[PDB]
């Protein structure tokens, strides 16, 4: 239980609980220990075996008393800090293309196992010095939920929420992760958030002003969604060439397929891996200081 870990420093404050960098007192292993404060047992245990090089490995699930502990492999930096440190020059496109490629591999692995992330964002994308990028906070959303406030009452960001979630879809699909990854794709290219909304209706309207207000033509059945309103303002679609300059045509074509309104038209992770944008994909080494 907690005795075998030594708390090094606080990493971050997730929704369910606090995450610490810790040292296994017996094996010297440096891990990320998540303290979740209090069905879910069997759902978390289904993630012990969701192992993939682009998924942060869940090492052990400690269950003692009314406190639940998750032990992950430790990574030193999230994508958010790397984007901030690269804000002046921009992440080089070969590195952007490599991160997107690896995350689509990770997504394709979890969607084939019917596991959704439901909350992709730069803050839970972790990188190392070797050029790898991994998905974190994976599978916990179905185990507890995606609440509005964290345990430290911080607001959950909506910038990467798929429109079907914002429109009240109860049973969304794997396409919600492709949408979030598309928004992260755009943010890495332009060094600015694609849809930085501070409310659910502001997030939805910021999507509408960029991609046009959806209708039955582009999204069959959107007018029947639980939170759709006919009184939605009707904005025209902006051209993608102004959305993410100076991304090349391969990248803009891929991004537009990741940002399709209709979840059934949105490109899958496996299909996106065959997109010509990755014809020249490599694995560069990032410029990190730890
Ligand atoms: C993604 C994090 C965010 C914390 C809450 C969600 N969660 N659950 C586990 C981990 C985790 N985290 C790490 N590494 C790490 C991550 C972030 C940071 N900080 C540095 C200081 N910044 C101000 C914020 C980011 C440091 N280290 N490795 C492995 C992991 F499973 C994380």
Helix (H) / strand (E) containing 82: helix 79-85
Instruction: Examine the domain organization and report whether 221 and 181 are in the same domain.
Output: yes
What is the C-alpha end-to-end distance of the chain, expressed in Å?
29
Known binding residue 19? Answer is: yes
Instruction: Examine the domain organization and report whether 67 and 82 are in the same domain.
Output: no
Instruction: Examine the domain organization and report whether 233 and 259 are in the same domain.
Output: yes
Boundary of a domain, candidates 18, 49, 73: 73
| Residue located nearest, by CA, to atom 2 of ligand 1 | 124
Resolution of the coordinates in A?
Answer: 2.0
How many angstroms separate the alpha carbon of residue 128 from the centre of ligand 1?
12
Instruction: Examine the domain organization and report whether 91 and 57 are in the same domain.
Output: no
**Torsion from C-alpha of 239, 245, 246, 250, nearest 10 degrees:** -40
Boundary of a domain, candidates 56, 73, 90: 73
Instruction: Examine the domain organization and report whether 124 and 15 are in the same domain.
Output: no
Give Cα separations from 269 to 139, 174, 225, 285 (angstroms): 17, 9, 25, 24
How many angstroms separate the alpha carbon of residue 50 from the centre of ligand 1?
19
197-206 long-range Cβ contacts below 8 angstroms, 24+ apart: 197/158, 197/159, 198/155, 198/158, 199/158, 200/158, 200/166, 203/158, 203/159, 203/161, 203/166, 204/163, 204/166, 204/167, 205/233
In a domain, 263, yes or no: yes
Q: Are strands 125-127 and 133-135 parallel, antiparallel or unpaired?
A: antiparallel
Known binding residue 11? Answer is: yes
The total number of structural domains that make up the chain: 2
Pocket test for ligand 1, best of 19, 84, 118, 127 (most atoms within 8 A of CB): 19
Instruction: Examine the domain organization and report whether 197 and 269 are in the same domain.
Output: yes
Task: Give SS3 for 19.
Answer: strand
Instruction: Examine the domain organization and report whether 157 and 266 are in the same domain.
Output: yes
| Residue located nearest, by CA, to atom 18 of ligand 1 | 11
In a domain, 284, yes or no: no
In a domain, 111, yes or no: yes
Sheet with 58-64, edge to edge strand ranges: 5-13, 17-24, 30-37, 67-73, 58-64
Instruction: Examine the domain organization and report whether 225 and 273 are in the same domain.
Output: yes
Q: Quick check: is 119 catalytic?
A: yes
How many angstroms separate the alpha carbon of residue 96 from the centre of ligand 1?
20
Alpha helix stretches (DSSP H) within 124-239 = 140-143, 163-166, 175-190, 200-211
- The C-alpha atoms of residue 214 and residue 230 are separated, in whole angstroms, by 11
Instruction: Examine the domain organization and report whether 111 and 193 are in the same domain.
Output: yes
Residue 137: left (phi > 0), alpha (psi -120 to 50), or beta?
left
Boundary of a domain, candidates 40, 73, 106: 73
Maximum pairwise Cα distance, the chain: 62
Under a CB-based contact definition with an 8 Å cutoff, are residues 203 and 197 in contact? yes
| Residue located nearest, by CA, to atom 13 of ligand 1 | 75
Known binding residue 150? Answer is: no
Atom of ligand 1 nearest to the CA of 75: 28
Task: Give SS3 for 51.
Answer: coil
With a Cβ cut-off of 6 Å, ligand 1 is lined by: 11-12, 14, 19, 32, 34, 56, 72, 74-75, 78, 81, 123-124, 126, 136-137
| Residue located nearest, by CA, to atom 14 of ligand 1 | 75
What residue numbers bound the domain in which 53 lies? 2-73
Under a CB-based contact definition with an 8 Å cutoff, are residues 222 and 215 in contact? yes
Instruction: Examine the domain organization and report whether 49 and 81 are in the same domain.
Output: no
Instruction: Examine the domain organization and report whether 105 and 209 are in the same domain.
Output: yes
Query: Solved how?
Result: X-ray
Known binding residue 121? Answer is: yes
- The C-alpha atoms of residue 222 and residue 244 are separated, in whole angstroms, by 26
């Amino acid at each position: 239980f907690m005795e075998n870990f030594q708390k090094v420093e606080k990493i971050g404050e997730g929704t369910y609980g606090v995450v610490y960098k810790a040292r296994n007192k017996l094996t010297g292993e440096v891990v990320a220990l998540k303290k979740i404060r209090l069905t879910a047992i069997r759902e978390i245990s289904l993630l012990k075996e969701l192992n993939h090089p682009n998924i942060v490995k869940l090492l052990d699930v400690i269950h003692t008393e009314n406190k639940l502990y998750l032990v992950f492999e430790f990574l030193h930096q999230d994508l958010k800090k790397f984007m901030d440190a690269s804000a002046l020059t921009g992440i080089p496109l070969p590195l952007i293309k490599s991160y997107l490629f690896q995350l689509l591999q990770g997504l394709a692995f979890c969607h084939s196992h019917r596991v959704l992330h439901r909350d992709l964002k730069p803050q839970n994308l972790l990188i190392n010095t070797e050029g790898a990028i991994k998905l974190a906070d994976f599978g916990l959303a179905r185990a507890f939920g995606v609440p509005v406030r964290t345990y430290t009452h911080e607001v959950v960001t909506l910038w990467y929420r798929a429109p079907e979630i914002l429109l009240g879809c109860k049973y969304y699909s794997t396409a919600v992760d492709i949408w979030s990854l598309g928004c992260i794709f755009a943010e890495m290219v332009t060094r600015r958030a694609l849809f930085p909304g501070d409310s659910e209706i502001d997030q939805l309207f910021r999507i509408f002003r960029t991609l046009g207000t959806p209708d039955e033509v582009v999204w069959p059945g959107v007018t029947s969604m639980p939170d759709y309103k006919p009184s939605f303002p009707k904005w025209a679609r902006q051209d993608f060439s102004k959305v993410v300059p100076p991304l090349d045509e391969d990248g803009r074509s891929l991004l537009s397929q990741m940002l399709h309104y209709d979840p059934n038209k949105r490109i899958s992770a496996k299909a996106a891996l065959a997109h010509p944008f990755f014809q020249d994909v490599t694995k560069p080494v990032p410029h990190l200081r730890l």
